[PDB]
Amino acid sequence: VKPLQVEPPEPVVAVALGASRQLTCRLACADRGASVQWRGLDTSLGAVQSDTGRSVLTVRNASLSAAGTRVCVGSCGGRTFQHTVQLLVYAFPNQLTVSPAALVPGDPEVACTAHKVTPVDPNALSFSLLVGGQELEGAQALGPEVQQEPIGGDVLFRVTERWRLPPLGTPVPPALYCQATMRLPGLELSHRQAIPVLGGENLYFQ
């Protein structure tokens, strides 16, 4: 049995930018002088070590700089125990812009832009173009464009996907949807934004 335990116990924990999270490190020790240390990968920022059986790490209003490896180290009866946990900090986009905002007959393309997002890695962040609740088959993705989006003291990103549309068939769907999805350890986040599809006379009502 291990005398050192951390709650939550998972080796990686995802925390949203601006959110809070605590890690509680407990050390069972029958002998006096037990100590618990929380630190980063090294101690260039300062390690905190206390004479205790319970030490809690709290990131508050998380910044991107909170991301990285944390280690709790316990000392009891001359032995050392450890637990390593990786904090991932992510910014799920707070806005998704679609262009054009509504489609009319003849429109060949949709663009969807996620604002203030990180990470942008395609294995974490994905875009899909839906018709009803299914992905639209044959929509040709033209590759994400990634630009920097500075917010406060952190660099987030603005990411645009574009699709060349296939024939929509008949009857024509009432709407398409852009969806941005972020997959991280233990969780999946999504944002779906409607794109109305209008009739063939709309162009003449401008």
From Swiss-Prot:
Glycan-linked positions: N61
Membrane topology designation: Single-pass type I membrane protein
Expression tissues: Highly expressed on high endothelial venules (HEV) and lamina propia venules found in the small intestine, and to a lesser extent in the colon and spleen. Very low levels of expression found in pancreas and brain. Not expressed in the thymus, prostate, ovaries, testis, heart, placenta, lung, liver, skeletal muscle, kidney or peripheral blood leukocytes.
UniProt subcellular location: Membrane
Entry's Gene Ontology cellular component terms: membrane; plasma membrane
Keywords assigned by UniProt, alphabetized: Cell adhesion, Disulfide bond, Glycoprotein, Immunoglobulin domain, Membrane, Repeat, Signal, Transmembrane, Transmembrane helix
A molecular function GO annotation: integrin binding involved in cell-matrix adhesion
Domain Ig-like, residue spans: 1-90, 91-198
One example of a Gene Ontology biological process annotation: cell adhesion
This protein's record includes keyword Transmembrane: yes
Domain of life: Eukaryota
Main location: membrane
Ranges in the topological domain labelled Extracellular: 1-198
Disulfide bonds listed in the record: C25-C72, C29-C76, C112-C178
UniProt PTM comment: The Ser/Thr-rich mucin-like domain may provide possible sites for O-glycosylation.
Oligomer status and interactors: Homodimer.
Known role: Cell adhesion leukocyte receptor expressed by mucosal venules, helps to direct lymphocyte traffic into mucosal tissues including the Peyer patches and the intestinal lamina propria. It can bind both integrin alpha-4/beta-7 and L-selectin, regulating both the passage and retention of leukocytes. Isoform 2, lacking the mucin-like domain, may be specialized in supporting integrin alpha-4/beta-7-dependent adhesion strengthening, independent of L-selectin binding.
Protein name: Mucosal addressin cell adhesion molecule 1
Species assigned in the record: Homo sapiens (Human)
Lineage: Eukaryota, Metazoa, Chordata, Craniata, Vertebrata
Gene that encodes the chain: MADCAM1
Section covered of the full-length record: 23 to 224 of 382
